[PDB]
Coordinates of C-alpha atoms in Angstrom, one line a residue:
Chain Z
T1 CA 16.6 6.0 6.7
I2 CA 14.7 7.8 9.5
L3 CA 11.8 6.1 11.4
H4 CA 8.5 7.3 10.5
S5 CA 7.8 7.9 14.1
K6 CA 10.6 9.9 14.5
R7 CA 10.2 11.9 11.0
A8 CA 8.7 15.7 11.6
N9 CA 7.1 16.6 8.6
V10 CA 3.6 16.5 7.4
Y11 CA 2.9 18.4 4.2
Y12 CA -0.7 19.7 2.9
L13 CA -0.1 21.1 -0.5
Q14 CA -2.4 22.9 -3.1
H15 CA -2.2 24.8 -6.3
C16 CA 1.2 23.4 -7.3
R17 CA 3.0 21.0 -9.5
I18 CA 5.4 18.1 -7.5
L19 CA 8.0 17.0 -10.1
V20 CA 11.9 16.2 -9.5
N21 CA 14.0 18.8 -10.6
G22 CA 17.8 18.0 -10.4
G23 CA 17.1 14.4 -8.3
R24 CA 15.4 16.8 -5.7
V25 CA 11.5 16.4 -5.2
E26 CA 10.0 19.9 -5.3
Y27 CA 6.5 21.4 -5.5
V28 CA 6.1 24.3 -8.0
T29 CA 3.9 27.0 -7.5
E30 CA 3.0 29.3 -10.2
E31 CA 1.6 32.6 -8.4
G32 CA 2.1 35.0 -11.4
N33 CA 4.6 34.6 -14.7
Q34 CA 7.1 32.9 -12.5
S35 CA 7.4 29.8 -11.0
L36 CA 8.8 29.4 -7.5
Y37 CA 10.6 25.7 -6.5
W38 CA 10.2 24.5 -2.7
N39 CA 12.1 21.5 -1.6
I40 CA 10.6 18.6 0.0
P41 CA 12.6 16.9 2.4
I42 CA 11.3 13.4 2.0
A43 CA 13.6 11.3 4.3
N44 CA 12.2 13.6 7.0
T45 CA 8.6 13.4 5.9
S46 CA 6.0 10.9 6.6
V47 CA 2.7 11.9 4.7
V48 CA 1.9 14.5 1.6
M49 CA -1.7 15.4 1.1
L50 CA -2.4 16.9 -2.0
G51 CA -5.7 19.1 -2.3
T52 CA -7.0 21.2 -5.1
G53 CA -4.9 22.0 -8.0
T54 CA -2.1 19.8 -7.3
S55 CA -0.1 17.2 -9.7
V56 CA 2.6 14.7 -9.4
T57 CA 4.7 13.2 -11.9
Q58 CA 6.3 9.6 -12.0
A59 CA 9.5 10.3 -11.2
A60 CA 8.2 11.9 -8.2
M61 CA 6.4 9.2 -7.4
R62 CA 9.4 6.9 -7.5
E63 CA 11.0 9.1 -4.8
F64 CA 8.4 9.3 -2.2
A65 CA 8.0 5.4 -2.6
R66 CA 11.8 4.5 -2.2
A67 CA 11.9 6.8 1.1
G68 CA 8.5 5.7 2.2
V69 CA 6.5 8.5 2.1
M70 CA 2.6 7.8 2.1
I71 CA 0.8 9.8 -0.8
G72 CA -2.8 11.1 -0.3
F73 CA -5.0 12.9 -2.8
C74 CA -7.9 14.5 -1.1
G75 CA -10.6 17.1 -1.9
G76 CA -9.0 19.9 -0.3
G77 CA -10.6 22.4 2.4
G78 CA -11.7 19.6 4.4
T79 CA -13.7 18.1 1.4
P80 CA -13.4 14.7 0.4
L81 CA -11.8 13.7 -3.0
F82 CA -14.8 12.5 -4.6
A83 CA -18.8 13.3 -3.1
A84 CA -21.7 12.0 -4.0
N85 CA -25.2 11.6 -2.7
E86 CA -24.1 8.7 -0.8
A87 CA -21.2 7.5 -2.6
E88 CA -17.7 9.5 -1.1
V89 CA -14.2 8.8 -1.6
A90 CA -12.3 10.8 1.6
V91 CA -8.8 10.1 0.2
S92 CA -7.0 8.3 -2.7
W93 CA -4.3 6.9 -1.3
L94 CA -0.9 5.7 -3.0
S95 CA 0.7 3.4 -0.9
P96 CA 4.7 2.7 -1.3
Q97 CA 5.0 -1.0 -3.1
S98 CA 8.8 -1.0 -2.9
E99 CA 9.9 -0.6 0.7
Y100 CA 9.0 -4.2 2.1
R101 CA 6.9 -4.2 5.2
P102 CA 7.3 -6.5 8.5
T103 CA 4.5 -9.3 8.1
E104 CA 3.7 -10.5 12.0
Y105 CA 1.4 -7.7 11.9
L106 CA -0.5 -8.5 8.9
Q107 CA -0.8 -12.1 9.9
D108 CA -2.0 -11.2 13.4
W109 CA -4.5 -8.9 11.9
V110 CA -5.9 -11.8 9.0
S111 CA -6.1 -14.5 11.7
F112 CA -9.1 -12.6 13.4
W113 CA -10.6 -10.3 11.0
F114 CA -12.8 -12.4 9.4
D115 CA -14.6 -13.4 12.6
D116 CA -17.2 -10.7 13.3
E117 CA -17.2 -11.1 17.0
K118 CA -13.4 -10.6 17.0
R119 CA -13.6 -7.8 14.5
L120 CA -16.2 -5.9 17.2
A121 CA -13.5 -6.6 20.1
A122 CA -10.9 -4.3 18.1
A123 CA -13.3 -1.6 17.6
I124 CA -14.3 -1.3 21.0
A125 CA -10.7 -1.9 22.0
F126 CA -9.9 1.1 19.6
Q127 CA -12.9 3.5 21.7
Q128 CA -11.0 2.4 24.9
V129 CA -7.6 3.6 23.8
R130 CA -9.8 7.1 22.7
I131 CA -11.1 7.6 25.7
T132 CA -7.6 7.0 27.4
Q133 CA -6.2 9.8 24.9
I134 CA -8.6 12.2 25.5
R135 CA -8.4 11.9 29.1
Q136 CA -4.8 12.2 28.9
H137 CA -4.5 15.0 26.8
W138 CA -7.4 17.1 27.4
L139 CA -6.1 17.3 31.3
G140 CA -2.3 17.0 30.6
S141 CA 0.3 19.8 30.9
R142 CA 0.1 20.6 27.3
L143 CA -2.9 21.9 27.0
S144 CA -3.2 23.6 30.4
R145 CA -1.1 25.9 29.5
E146 CA -4.1 27.1 27.0
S147 CA -5.8 29.5 29.1
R148 CA -8.6 30.0 26.6
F149 CA -9.5 26.2 27.4
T150 CA -11.3 26.0 30.4
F151 CA -13.9 23.3 31.4
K152 CA -14.7 21.4 34.5
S153 CA -12.5 18.3 34.8
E154 CA -15.6 16.6 36.1
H155 CA -17.8 16.9 33.4
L156 CA -15.4 15.4 30.8
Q157 CA -14.8 12.5 33.3
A158 CA -18.4 11.7 33.8
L159 CA -18.6 11.6 29.9
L160 CA -15.6 9.6 29.3
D161 CA -16.7 7.1 32.1
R162 CA -20.8 7.1 30.6
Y163 CA -19.1 6.3 27.4
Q164 CA -16.7 3.2 28.8
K165 CA -19.8 1.7 30.6
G166 CA -21.7 2.2 27.5
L167 CA -19.1 0.2 25.4
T168 CA -19.4 -3.0 27.5
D169 CA -23.4 -3.1 26.8
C170 CA -22.5 -3.1 22.8
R171 CA -23.1 -5.9 21.3
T172 CA -23.0 -5.1 17.6
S173 CA -21.1 -2.8 15.4
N174 CA -24.0 -0.7 15.1
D175 CA -24.3 -0.2 18.9
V176 CA -20.7 1.0 19.0
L177 CA -21.8 3.7 16.3
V178 CA -24.6 4.8 18.2
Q179 CA -22.6 5.2 21.8
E180 CA -19.9 7.4 19.6
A181 CA -22.4 9.2 18.3
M182 CA -23.9 10.2 22.1
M183 CA -20.0 10.7 23.2
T184 CA -18.8 12.8 20.5
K185 CA -22.1 15.1 20.3
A186 CA -21.4 16.0 24.0
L187 CA -17.7 16.4 23.6
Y188 CA -18.2 18.9 20.7
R189 CA -20.7 20.7 23.3
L190 CA -17.9 20.5 26.2
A191 CA -15.2 21.8 23.8
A192 CA -17.4 24.6 22.4
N193 CA -18.3 25.9 26.0
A194 CA -14.6 25.7 27.0
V195 CA -13.5 28.5 24.3
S196 CA -16.9 30.4 25.1
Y197 CA -17.9 29.4 21.3
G198 CA -21.5 30.0 21.7
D199 CA -24.2 27.7 19.7
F200 CA -22.3 24.7 18.0
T201 CA -23.6 21.9 15.6
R202 CA -21.1 19.7 14.1
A203 CA -21.8 19.7 10.1
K204 CA -21.4 16.0 9.4
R205 CA -22.0 16.8 5.6
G206 CA -18.6 19.3 5.9
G207 CA -20.7 21.8 4.4
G208 CA -20.3 24.2 7.8
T209 CA -19.6 27.6 7.2
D210 CA -18.3 28.9 10.9
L211 CA -14.5 28.4 11.7
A212 CA -14.9 25.7 14.1
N213 CA -16.6 23.2 11.4
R214 CA -14.3 24.0 9.0
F215 CA -11.1 23.7 11.1
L216 CA -12.6 20.3 12.5
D217 CA -12.8 19.4 8.4
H218 CA -9.5 20.1 7.9
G219 CA -8.0 18.4 11.0
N220 CA -9.6 15.2 10.2
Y221 CA -8.0 14.7 7.0
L222 CA -4.4 15.5 8.9
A223 CA -5.3 12.8 11.1
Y224 CA -5.9 10.7 8.2
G225 CA -3.0 11.0 6.6
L226 CA -1.0 10.1 10.1
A227 CA -3.6 7.2 10.1
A228 CA -2.1 5.9 6.6
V229 CA 1.1 5.8 7.7
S230 CA 0.6 3.9 10.8
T231 CA -1.2 0.8 8.8
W232 CA 1.5 1.1 6.4
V233 CA 4.3 0.9 8.6
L234 CA 2.8 -2.4 10.2
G235 CA 1.8 -3.6 6.6
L236 CA -1.8 -2.9 7.3
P237 CA -3.8 -2.5 4.2
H238 CA -6.3 0.4 4.8
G239 CA -9.2 -2.0 3.8
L240 CA -9.2 -4.0 6.6
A241 CA -11.0 -1.8 8.9
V242 CA -12.9 -2.4 12.3
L243 CA -15.7 -0.2 12.7
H244 CA -15.8 2.2 9.8
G245 CA -15.4 -0.3 7.2
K246 CA -18.9 -1.0 6.6
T247 CA -19.6 2.5 5.0
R248 CA -16.3 4.2 3.7
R249 CA -13.5 2.6 1.6
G250 CA -9.9 2.9 3.4
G251 CA -12.0 2.2 6.4
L252 CA -8.8 1.6 8.9
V253 CA -7.5 4.7 8.1
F254 CA -11.0 6.4 9.9
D255 CA -10.7 3.7 12.5
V256 CA -7.1 4.6 13.5
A257 CA -7.7 8.4 13.0
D258 CA -10.0 8.4 16.0
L259 CA -7.4 7.3 18.2
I260 CA -6.3 10.8 18.4
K261 CA -8.8 13.1 16.6
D262 CA -10.9 14.0 19.3
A263 CA -7.8 14.2 21.6
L264 CA -5.9 16.3 19.6
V265 CA -7.7 17.7 16.8
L266 CA -10.7 18.9 18.4
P267 CA -9.6 21.3 21.3
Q268 CA -7.2 23.0 18.8
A269 CA -10.5 23.3 16.3
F270 CA -12.4 25.6 18.7
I271 CA -8.9 27.3 20.1
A272 CA -8.0 28.7 16.8
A273 CA -11.7 29.5 15.8
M274 CA -11.9 31.6 18.7
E275 CA -8.6 33.1 18.0
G276 CA -9.5 34.3 14.4
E277 CA -7.0 32.4 12.5
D278 CA -6.8 31.2 8.9
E279 CA -6.4 27.3 8.0
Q280 CA -2.3 27.5 8.0
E281 CA -2.3 28.8 11.5
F282 CA -4.7 25.9 12.8
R283 CA -2.6 23.7 10.8
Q284 CA 0.3 24.4 12.5
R285 CA -1.5 23.6 16.0
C286 CA -2.3 20.4 14.8
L287 CA 1.0 19.5 13.2
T288 CA 2.6 20.6 16.4
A289 CA 0.0 18.6 18.7
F290 CA 0.9 15.5 16.4
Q291 CA 4.8 16.0 17.6
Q292 CA 4.7 16.7 21.1
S293 CA 2.1 13.8 21.7
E294 CA 3.6 11.3 19.7
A295 CA 0.4 10.8 17.9
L296 CA 2.0 8.6 15.4
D297 CA 3.7 6.6 18.2
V298 CA 0.1 6.3 19.7
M299 CA -1.4 4.9 16.5
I300 CA 1.2 2.5 15.8
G301 CA 1.4 1.4 19.3
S302 CA -2.3 1.0 19.7
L303 CA -2.4 -1.4 16.7
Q304 CA 0.4 -3.4 17.6
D305 CA -1.5 -3.8 20.9
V306 CA -4.9 -4.8 19.5
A307 CA -3.1 -7.2 17.0
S308 CA -1.4 -9.3 19.5
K309 CA -4.4 -9.3 21.5
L310 CA -6.7 -10.8 19.2
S311 CA -4.4 -12.5 17.3
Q312 CA -4.9 -16.6 16.6
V313 CA -1.7 -17.6 15.8
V314 CA -0.4 -20.5 17.7
Chain V
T1 CA 0.9 -3.2 -26.4
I2 CA -0.3 -1.0 -23.8
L3 CA -2.1 -4.1 -22.5
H4 CA 0.2 -5.8 -19.9
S5 CA -2.3 -8.4 -18.3
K6 CA -5.1 -9.8 -19.9
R7 CA -6.2 -11.6 -17.0
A8 CA -6.7 -8.7 -14.7
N9 CA -7.0 -5.7 -17.6
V10 CA -3.7 -3.6 -16.6
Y11 CA -2.9 -0.9 -18.9
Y12 CA 0.8 0.4 -18.8
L13 CA 0.9 4.3 -19.9
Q14 CA 3.8 6.3 -20.7
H15 CA 5.1 10.1 -21.9
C16 CA 1.4 11.8 -21.1
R17 CA 0.1 14.3 -19.0
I18 CA -3.4 12.9 -17.6
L19 CA -5.8 15.7 -16.9
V20 CA -9.6 16.7 -16.9
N21 CA -10.7 18.9 -19.5
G22 CA -14.6 19.6 -19.8
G23 CA -15.1 17.1 -17.1
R24 CA -13.7 14.3 -19.0
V25 CA -10.3 12.4 -18.5
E26 CA -8.2 13.2 -21.2
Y27 CA -4.5 11.9 -22.1
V28 CA -2.2 14.7 -23.6
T29 CA 0.7 12.5 -25.1
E30 CA 3.4 13.7 -26.4
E31 CA 3.9 13.9 -29.9
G32 CA 5.6 10.7 -31.0
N33 CA 3.8 8.6 -28.2
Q34 CA 1.0 7.1 -31.0
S35 CA -0.7 4.9 -28.5
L36 CA -4.4 4.8 -27.8
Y37 CA -5.0 5.4 -24.4
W38 CA -8.5 6.8 -25.0
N39 CA -9.7 3.3 -25.6
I40 CA -9.2 2.3 -22.0
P41 CA -12.7 2.1 -20.3
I42 CA -12.5 4.1 -17.4
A43 CA -14.6 1.3 -15.5
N44 CA -13.8 -0.6 -12.2
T45 CA -12.7 -3.4 -14.3
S46 CA -9.4 -1.2 -15.7
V47 CA -6.1 -0.8 -13.9
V48 CA -4.0 1.9 -15.1
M49 CA -0.2 2.0 -14.4
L50 CA 1.6 5.5 -15.2
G51 CA 5.2 4.8 -16.2
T52 CA 8.0 6.7 -17.5
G53 CA 7.2 10.5 -18.4
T54 CA 3.6 10.5 -16.7
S55 CA 1.9 13.2 -14.6
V56 CA -1.5 13.0 -13.1
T57 CA -3.6 16.0 -11.9
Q58 CA -5.9 15.6 -8.6
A59 CA -8.9 16.3 -10.9
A60 CA -7.9 13.3 -13.0
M61 CA -7.7 11.0 -9.2
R62 CA -11.1 12.1 -8.5
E63 CA -12.3 10.7 -11.6
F64 CA -10.3 7.6 -11.1
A65 CA -11.6 7.5 -7.9
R66 CA -15.4 8.1 -9.0
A67 CA -15.0 5.3 -11.7
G68 CA -13.3 2.9 -9.5
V69 CA -10.2 2.7 -11.3
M70 CA -7.0 1.7 -9.6
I71 CA -4.2 3.7 -10.1
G72 CA -0.6 2.7 -9.7
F73 CA 2.9 4.1 -10.5
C74 CA 5.9 2.0 -12.1
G75 CA 9.0 2.2 -13.7
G76 CA 9.7 1.9 -17.7
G77 CA 7.6 -1.2 -19.4
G78 CA 5.6 -2.0 -16.5
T79 CA 8.4 -2.4 -13.4
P80 CA 8.8 -2.1 -10.8
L81 CA 6.0 -1.1 -9.0
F82 CA 6.6 2.3 -7.3
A83 CA 3.0 3.2 -5.2
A84 CA -0.4 2.4 -6.1
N85 CA -4.1 2.3 -4.8
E86 CA -4.8 -0.9 -2.8
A87 CA -7.3 -3.6 -3.8
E88 CA -10.1 -4.1 -0.9
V89 CA -11.6 -7.0 0.6
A90 CA -15.4 -6.6 0.9
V91 CA -17.4 -9.2 2.3
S92 CA -20.7 -9.4 3.6
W93 CA -20.0 -6.8 6.8
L94 CA -17.6 -4.1 4.3
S95 CA -20.3 -2.9 2.2
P96 CA -19.3 0.9 1.1
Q97 CA -20.8 3.1 -1.6
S98 CA -17.7 3.0 -3.9
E99 CA -17.5 2.0 -7.6
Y100 CA -14.2 0.1 -6.6
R101 CA -14.3 -3.5 -7.4
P102 CA -13.4 -5.6 -4.3
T103 CA -11.2 -8.9 -4.7
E104 CA -12.1 -12.2 -3.5
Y105 CA -8.5 -13.8 -3.3
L106 CA -7.4 -12.2 -0.1
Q107 CA -10.3 -14.3 1.9
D108 CA -9.4 -17.3 -0.1
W109 CA -5.6 -16.6 0.8
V110 CA -6.3 -16.7 4.6
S111 CA -8.9 -19.4 4.3
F112 CA -5.7 -21.9 4.0
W113 CA -2.8 -19.9 4.6
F114 CA -2.5 -20.8 8.4
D115 CA -3.0 -24.5 7.7
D116 CA 0.6 -25.8 7.5
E117 CA -0.4 -28.7 4.8
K118 CA -2.2 -26.5 2.9
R119 CA 0.3 -23.7 2.8
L120 CA 2.9 -26.1 1.8
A121 CA 0.7 -27.6 -1.0
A122 CA 0.8 -24.0 -2.4
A123 CA 4.5 -23.9 -2.1
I124 CA 4.9 -27.1 -4.3
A125 CA 2.1 -25.5 -6.8
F126 CA 4.5 -22.7 -7.2
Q127 CA 7.3 -25.0 -7.8
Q128 CA 5.4 -27.0 -10.4
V129 CA 4.7 -23.8 -12.5
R130 CA 8.4 -22.6 -12.3
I131 CA 9.1 -26.3 -13.6
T132 CA 6.7 -25.8 -16.6
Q133 CA 8.1 -22.6 -16.8
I134 CA 11.8 -23.1 -17.2
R135 CA 11.0 -26.5 -19.6
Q136 CA 8.7 -24.2 -22.0
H137 CA 10.9 -20.8 -21.9
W138 CA 14.7 -22.3 -22.2
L139 CA 13.6 -24.5 -25.0
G140 CA 10.9 -22.2 -26.7
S141 CA 11.8 -20.1 -29.7
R142 CA 12.9 -17.1 -28.4
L143 CA 15.7 -18.4 -26.6
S144 CA 16.8 -20.8 -29.3
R145 CA 17.9 -17.6 -31.8
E146 CA 20.3 -17.2 -29.0
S147 CA 23.5 -18.6 -30.2
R148 CA 25.3 -17.7 -27.6
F149 CA 23.2 -19.7 -25.2
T150 CA 24.0 -23.4 -26.5
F151 CA 23.4 -26.7 -24.1
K152 CA 21.6 -30.1 -24.5
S153 CA 18.3 -30.0 -23.8
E154 CA 18.6 -33.6 -22.0
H155 CA 20.5 -31.9 -19.2
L156 CA 17.8 -29.6 -18.4
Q157 CA 15.3 -32.5 -19.0
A158 CA 17.2 -34.6 -16.2
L159 CA 17.5 -31.7 -14.3
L160 CA 14.1 -30.6 -14.0
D161 CA 12.9 -34.3 -13.4
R162 CA 15.2 -35.1 -10.7
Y163 CA 13.8 -31.7 -8.9
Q164 CA 10.2 -32.9 -9.8
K165 CA 10.8 -36.4 -8.0
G166 CA 12.5 -34.4 -5.0
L167 CA 9.2 -32.2 -4.5
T168 CA 7.0 -35.2 -4.3
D169 CA 9.0 -36.7 -1.4
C170 CA 8.5 -33.1 0.6
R171 CA 6.5 -33.1 4.0
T172 CA 7.5 -30.2 5.4
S173 CA 8.4 -26.7 4.1
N174 CA 12.2 -27.3 4.7
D175 CA 12.1 -29.9 2.4
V176 CA 11.0 -28.3 -0.6
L177 CA 13.8 -25.1 0.6
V178 CA 16.6 -28.2 0.2
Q179 CA 15.4 -29.4 -2.8
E180 CA 14.7 -26.0 -4.8
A181 CA 18.6 -25.0 -3.4
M182 CA 20.1 -28.1 -5.2
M183 CA 17.9 -27.7 -8.2
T184 CA 18.9 -24.0 -8.2
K185 CA 22.7 -24.2 -7.7
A186 CA 22.6 -27.3 -10.6
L187 CA 20.4 -24.7 -13.1
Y188 CA 22.9 -21.8 -12.6
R189 CA 25.9 -24.2 -13.1
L190 CA 23.7 -25.0 -16.4
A191 CA 23.5 -21.6 -17.4
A192 CA 27.0 -20.5 -16.6
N193 CA 28.0 -23.4 -18.8
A194 CA 25.7 -22.7 -21.6
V195 CA 27.2 -19.5 -22.3
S196 CA 31.1 -21.1 -21.0
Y197 CA 31.4 -18.4 -18.6
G198 CA 34.1 -20.3 -16.2
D199 CA 33.8 -20.0 -12.4
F200 CA 30.4 -19.0 -11.0
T201 CA 29.6 -18.4 -7.5
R202 CA 25.9 -16.5 -6.7
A203 CA 27.0 -13.5 -4.4
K204 CA 24.4 -13.1 -1.8
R205 CA 23.4 -9.8 -0.5
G206 CA 23.9 -7.9 -3.4
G207 CA 27.8 -8.1 -2.6
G208 CA 29.0 -9.5 -6.5
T209 CA 31.3 -7.8 -8.7
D210 CA 31.2 -9.9 -11.6
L211 CA 28.8 -9.1 -14.4
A212 CA 26.8 -12.2 -14.0
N213 CA 25.9 -11.5 -10.3
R214 CA 25.3 -7.9 -11.0
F215 CA 23.0 -8.8 -13.7
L216 CA 21.2 -11.4 -11.7
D217 CA 20.6 -8.6 -8.9
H218 CA 19.0 -6.1 -11.5
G219 CA 17.2 -8.9 -13.0
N220 CA 15.6 -9.8 -9.7
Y221 CA 14.7 -6.4 -9.0
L222 CA 12.7 -6.2 -12.1
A223 CA 11.0 -9.7 -11.5
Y224 CA 10.2 -8.5 -7.8
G225 CA 9.0 -5.5 -9.2
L226 CA 6.4 -7.1 -11.5
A227 CA 5.4 -9.6 -9.1
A228 CA 4.5 -6.6 -6.7
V229 CA 2.5 -5.9 -9.7
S230 CA 0.2 -9.3 -9.5
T231 CA -0.1 -9.3 -5.9
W232 CA -1.6 -5.7 -5.8
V233 CA -4.1 -6.3 -9.1
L234 CA -5.2 -9.3 -6.6
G235 CA -5.1 -7.5 -3.1
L236 CA -3.1 -9.8 -1.9
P237 CA -0.3 -8.4 0.9
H238 CA 3.5 -9.4 0.6
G239 CA 3.4 -10.6 4.3
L240 CA 2.0 -14.2 3.2
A241 CA 4.4 -16.2 2.0
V242 CA 4.0 -20.0 0.9
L243 CA 7.6 -20.9 0.5
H244 CA 9.6 -18.3 2.2
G245 CA 9.7 -17.9 6.0
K246 CA 6.9 -16.3 7.5
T247 CA 8.9 -13.5 8.9
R248 CA 10.8 -12.7 5.6
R249 CA 9.6 -9.1 4.7
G250 CA 8.1 -9.4 1.1
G251 CA 7.9 -12.8 0.8
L252 CA 5.1 -13.7 -1.0
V253 CA 6.5 -11.1 -3.4
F254 CA 9.6 -13.4 -3.8
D255 CA 7.8 -16.4 -3.9
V256 CA 5.4 -14.9 -6.9
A257 CA 8.5 -13.9 -8.5
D258 CA 10.3 -17.4 -8.4
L259 CA 7.7 -18.4 -10.9
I260 CA 9.4 -16.7 -14.0
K261 CA 12.4 -15.6 -12.7
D262 CA 14.8 -18.7 -13.5
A263 CA 13.0 -19.1 -16.7
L264 CA 13.3 -15.9 -18.4
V265 CA 16.0 -13.7 -16.0
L266 CA 18.6 -16.4 -15.5
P267 CA 19.7 -17.1 -19.2
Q268 CA 19.9 -13.2 -20.0
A269 CA 22.0 -12.4 -17.4
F270 CA 24.6 -14.7 -18.8
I271 CA 24.2 -14.0 -22.2
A272 CA 24.3 -10.4 -21.7
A273 CA 27.5 -10.8 -19.0
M274 CA 29.2 -13.0 -21.9
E275 CA 28.7 -9.8 -24.7
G276 CA 29.9 -7.0 -22.4
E277 CA 26.4 -5.2 -22.6
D278 CA 25.4 -2.7 -20.0
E279 CA 22.4 -1.8 -17.6
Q280 CA 20.3 -0.2 -20.0
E281 CA 20.7 -3.0 -22.6
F282 CA 20.4 -6.1 -20.2
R283 CA 16.9 -4.2 -18.9
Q284 CA 15.6 -4.5 -22.3
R285 CA 16.3 -7.9 -22.5
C286 CA 14.5 -8.9 -19.3
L287 CA 11.3 -6.6 -20.1
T288 CA 11.4 -8.3 -24.0
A289 CA 11.2 -11.7 -22.2
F290 CA 9.0 -10.5 -19.7
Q291 CA 6.4 -9.2 -22.6
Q292 CA 6.8 -12.1 -25.0
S293 CA 6.5 -14.8 -22.1
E294 CA 3.5 -13.1 -20.8
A295 CA 5.3 -13.3 -17.0
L296 CA 2.7 -11.0 -15.2
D297 CA -0.3 -12.8 -16.9
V298 CA 1.5 -16.3 -15.6
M299 CA 2.1 -14.8 -12.1
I300 CA -1.5 -13.3 -11.9
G301 CA -2.9 -16.9 -13.0
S302 CA -0.8 -18.7 -10.8
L303 CA -1.8 -17.0 -8.1
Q304 CA -5.8 -17.2 -9.1
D305 CA -5.1 -21.3 -9.8
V306 CA -3.6 -22.1 -6.6
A307 CA -6.6 -19.7 -4.5
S308 CA -9.2 -21.2 -6.0
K309 CA -7.7 -24.7 -5.9
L310 CA -7.1 -24.5 -2.4
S311 CA -9.6 -21.9 -1.1
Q312 CA -11.8 -23.2 2.4
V313 CA -14.8 -20.5 1.6
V314 CA -18.3 -21.4 0.9

């Protein structure tokens, strides 16, 4: 068995049937009247996301679970699986139930999760990790090699420090959501100007037509799958959220994705937009950034730190 | 026949493709499967497990997500549980716009689990249910039809009465572990003698070559898999055991499986060993025992009874 943070494969599949053929897990594409079989290395895979036109068999789900592979059904193309006027389910997660997870972090989590103040402290602690991650990867060596992404370091520093001070003034979870909105709005403008994108407004409803909004939508679901693996590895149920629980099902997946979403996905979205790339080329950018930045380790390590900080065990 | 739990509305499906036709969920069953899956309410009260020979499309998962129907994948006959949606714990501070039905049992469980005295009462309550199940199903109609398994009912009564007296003297978790080990050693001897097996030593770590230990290993797998179904539908995590050590992975699943394991699996393993049966034949003996003894409902009901009795909420 390979450790999840060492697994190198994240899959996003559409228009194919996933079954077991000769004991091996394969996804079958039917472009034409000929079927094509593609092997999935589940031992080296952490998460497989299933979009439009996908199906899975029970035998395939058996192998996924035994290998500890998180399976999620999403809407495809950056859309939620189920969308309504206010109702929305982003991803239906099929968590493996057969590979027993450690217990210590779960006991730490439930020991404080029902305290309103301790849940607020966890949410702030997530945003502080988010600030650290943005400062690190927006100014690091990997992104400096991208000559297309040019911005004034003082502008980002003033932004992160303004958000850092705003978090201390927060007293409710809604206060933090307001500060996150202000910070993310200025951060979108900074990333847009960094690539000479021109005018940009984030399509919060997911109905954006420009390449930046489309890539930001798709990049979020890539981050969701990585966050779903992080909470599972530590035996944390997706429903024990700290910030985005009061609106969305599977909230902790969204909270944990925020740890690396703006730091890794956001710059790659605007870069790929100005390069005129398709979805797969932008997908390879996010996946590579996830590997090289050890994004899975960041989410797992952040949850472990927060769990021990707020634990109420003796 | 397809309703595996009356308490949780858990339906088991096999040999059918689940898809969406004309905006409706439809079940394309193989000719020969004369089950009635169209009668399953597509509402948040229903739990659907997909067994042997099933498949599901992304479009059907969307409908299940819209209706709040939890989907799970299991092995043949309803065990083991492979992968499944998670049941979220919604309090007043986690109000999502999803039709899923949240479980109150997780908050009930956490409200007493950290109290060492309350955690002990739950463990003793489990062993009481265990005593009842052994008493009931070792002397019931189904097992009396087995001519190979012959024993004097007084021996079983005295064995169980001895263990019940020991439980009332226990004051710590370790006291219960010592009493259980004595009862279990005596019960395994009673079973081995009931079939005239001869020498029997329970091989830990799955390292037994004799048919008795092998069948006992396989039957534990089927019991743990069924217990995973009970914690899944109640939204209880595996890491909150009541008798097993707090650091033991999957401890709660093992505790829940102990409610019915010795009552149902233990006699069948020694019978099948003495009859020289194979894996598939012994697996059928266990499934039949689970179904006729309502093992899933016993586990679901016991967790509910302990949860409501020991809860500290409101």
